[PDB]
Paper text:
The purified assemblies were subjected to single-particle cryo-electron microscopy (cryoEM) for structure determination, yielding the first high-resolution model of the CISSc in its extended conformation, which also presents the first example of a CIS IId subtype.
This cap comprises one protein, Cis16, forming a C6-symmetrical complex that terminates the inner tube and sheath, respectively. (e) Top view (left) and side view (right) of ribbon diagrams showing the cap module of CISSc, revealing that the cap is composed of a Cis16 hexamer. The resulting maps of the baseplate and the cap reached resolutions of 3.5 and 3.4 Å, respectively.
Residue numbers in the entry:
A (entry chain 0B), B (entry chain 0A): 1 to 137, 143 to 215
C (entry chain 2A): 15 to 24, 31 to 94, 252 to 531
D (entry chain 1a), E (entry chain 1f): 4 to 149
Write the structure that this text describes.
Amino acid sequence: MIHEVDEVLKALLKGGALTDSGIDVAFEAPTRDWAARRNAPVVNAYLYDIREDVGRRHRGQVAVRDQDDIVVKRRQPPRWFRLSYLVTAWTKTPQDEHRLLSAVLATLLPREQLPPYELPGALGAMNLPVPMTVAGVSLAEIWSALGGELKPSLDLVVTAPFPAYPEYDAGPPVTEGATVRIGGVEGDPPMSEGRSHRPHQVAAARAARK
Amino acid sequence: MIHEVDEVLKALLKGGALTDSGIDVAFEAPTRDWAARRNAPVVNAYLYDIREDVGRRHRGQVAVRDQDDIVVKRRQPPRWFRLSYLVTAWTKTPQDEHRLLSAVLATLLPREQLPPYELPGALGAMNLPVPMTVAGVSLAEIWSALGGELKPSLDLVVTAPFPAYPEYDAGPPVTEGATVRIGGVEGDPPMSEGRSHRPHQVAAARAARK
Amino acid sequence: ASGSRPIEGVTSVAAFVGLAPTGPLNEPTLVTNWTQYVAAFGDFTGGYYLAHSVYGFFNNGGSAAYVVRVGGSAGFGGLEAIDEISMVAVPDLMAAYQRGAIDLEAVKAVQLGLIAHCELMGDRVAIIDPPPNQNARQIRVWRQETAGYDSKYAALYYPWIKSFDPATGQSRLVPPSGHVAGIWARNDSERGVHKAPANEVVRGAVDLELQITRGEQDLLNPIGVNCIRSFPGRGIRVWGARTLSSDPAWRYLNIRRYFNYLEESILIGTQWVVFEPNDHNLWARIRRNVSAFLVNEWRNGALFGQSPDQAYYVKCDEETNPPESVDLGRVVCEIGIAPVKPAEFVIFRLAQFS
Amino acid sequence: PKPEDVLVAPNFGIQIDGVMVEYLNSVSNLQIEQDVIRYQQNQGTTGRNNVTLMPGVAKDGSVQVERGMSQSSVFTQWINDSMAGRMATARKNATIIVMDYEDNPVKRWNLRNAWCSKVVAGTLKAGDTNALTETITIVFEELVVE
Amino acid sequence: PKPEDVLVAPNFGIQIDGVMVEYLNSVSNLQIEQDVIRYQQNQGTTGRNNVTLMPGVAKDGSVQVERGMSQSSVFTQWINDSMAGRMATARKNATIIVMDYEDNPVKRWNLRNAWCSKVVAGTLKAGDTNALTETITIVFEELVVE
């Protein structure tokens, strides 16, 4: 679900407070070769690394039920992955670069998380918030790795809830109640059928289920 | 607000203690190519990185009221961002470079913070102090990633308050007071209207505001 | 103290309207002691029951009073500007009626006006005293036909107390309200509002105008007439905790008094809500304050419930709809409580065999 | 969605009746606690052990809120009213609200009869870079979660 | 602006009446603390539990001051005056001031009847680099924030 996070970032940057000019948002790596060809004020949103948010992981058999108010599937809670974006502003004049970076920071500040309504279909099917943290705390080594030159930058962290889908199937529902067989441990009295739940008890349980 | 700080730095450096000569303050990256073209003594104030001051962040619903002494907006405290500037002095003679660096230190030391009125309109609208730290406290890696060569430098840290204002609105003021309806928990006595605040009580509460 | 204090319980102040020598006219004067009363108003220097009523109120135990003088030789509209008042009386109405200067119709009109005024303010209950020299059948007829009051804010007390008058050194007949109200205050100082102020002693009473037997009480009690009877080894005691209301749900004095006390305390504590935003924060604050106030009442045993949820419930969330009562600048809170009824009759059964 | 499906971000707030405090830097642990009471007895005729744990009274605590040092002295006035014994106005009802995104209150902790008892100024150092921090210890007789 | 809006930087100072000290390096925590008394009771008629927390007394304390030690021996003379029993002159009123950016006093902790109780010399090391410091412990009967 990175092809939804990048689209959300592009829509937010284009549709944010930077409506004065039609700036271009690019995900290309800001290397020297890339920087030597651009001729328009642009915003680079290069993906840097992918890590799993081990602090927000949850383990447990989550029940999934149909319209009959009976559980039919067993799944696992989604695992959160942290995606880091290096955000930079490229413009001919350094003060223009500074004001572009300020505008980007101002348009990214108010969104602490992202409601599922804004998210696209694939990510919005989760119906879960998508945290988005700007800045919030090595950059020299990263910039050297891309081969570019150190510039002021924003570290945008997005927490994508990737799914774990083993999708275990539960057994058929128990409709005729439970039957209990009782007897002696050593087998001196033979085990009996022991009967089962009366229809009145089953009806009462099915009525109280609502 | 980055450009507002830049303008503040330029005005402070030009209008500080370095009035003997018309020195030039530049924000360009001090790379080898940039250093090989300059022919006049200059002061470089290159922006290095942007980080959020998580230690000065405050969370709460700040009340904003109009002239009627009634709150009409609910905002959030601004978040402080740490902007780092690498400050260097470039001159042909190394002793002249040392003298220029000493002059910059002398002109930047006495300003621990910044008064709101001396700030530009965008920065001064917050009416909050802006801390400024000179050489408060790795530089080899920064210079290597920048592309230049190691030189004595100042790590000028400026704390810019970016307002994370959600502009959440509040409900209309209560003018008729409060009404309380009382009755039985199980509903044996029917719930009554219970009346409301007397007009004299409302008038006294309104007058006690002043 | 009205902008920062939370909801707290309320002293009981009795407002007395009548005639008295000297003092102001139609000006409610706060009196805290009998010495203050004689320093401001006059002592027993005339044929007025106001002095006797105040003396009985303070002797029986009274935190404060609001004396009002309208025609004292040698008015209820002025009591609408006071909030702490919880009961009212008109001792000198029967004093004027006895002389024949005022007919019974005017007395009935005055009592109806007093009851209507009590129903308006909503925080006080009136005390009614019948004309003197009346029997059980006579008082039943008077209460059912001539003065058929029907209100939840009125309590009638039939027999007249005979107290001591230092002016003449003899015993004089006075209405019991001035004493009875004092008894109420004693309850609020010794057993709380949740307990019916029935089994109490009229300290200032020496004798009664007519002893009431159980046969006559069997007819007087159901019509909402509270009696005062003398018991051997117990003295003069009030017998009856019923109001002059036809509603079975509001036929007990203690329930109405507790409801009025709770309403007044909540209204006093919620005085800071004026000009506050009508959002979820104000509703949460109101709910928290009301719950913190009511849990103390639940702990004291005034309300019935194993846990606070079953004894009281507060609903102030989303009840004030955005287009009704919110555009009008109003906030509505719903409170439900479970009081405890008193045990009026005690029945014993003795069996010879064992 | 489901109540368990919506997580909670550290977007909190406080509200003290009578004390004008808008924002807090941090809030300590507030817990709801109870006393467990073990008792061990042997079953009498046969001798098998049977240890039982059972409920005891609930407990009061001390929620502390830390706010940056400024000119305002609301906590100073609160503690000054406390030290003089005027507890008719010193005992206040407090609320700690924690909300998810969209600024909708999710959980509320109501402190009944909360009353501050300790104000501590942060250590002052000449070379210190961080802002001064004020620590306030607010003790409460009862804490009700809502 | 608003009193809460303006923050406080670690720019401070001290003033001791009779002791010529002008600057310090650090100041320990200054606590305004009140004793809390907890009492648990049960309602006689219903048996419900009520735990009440009420006030104690103002607590005396002590804050350590650590300055760059030098030839000056003002604190040495202070502790010498206190050591010989001349407490008429040993007890001095102290003030701790925290200022704003404009060097304008904001908070002034007044310290009543303060006398030095302990002077500690920093550990001396042959290969030590930083300056050698001196620690002073001062006990004040009362600490009123103004």
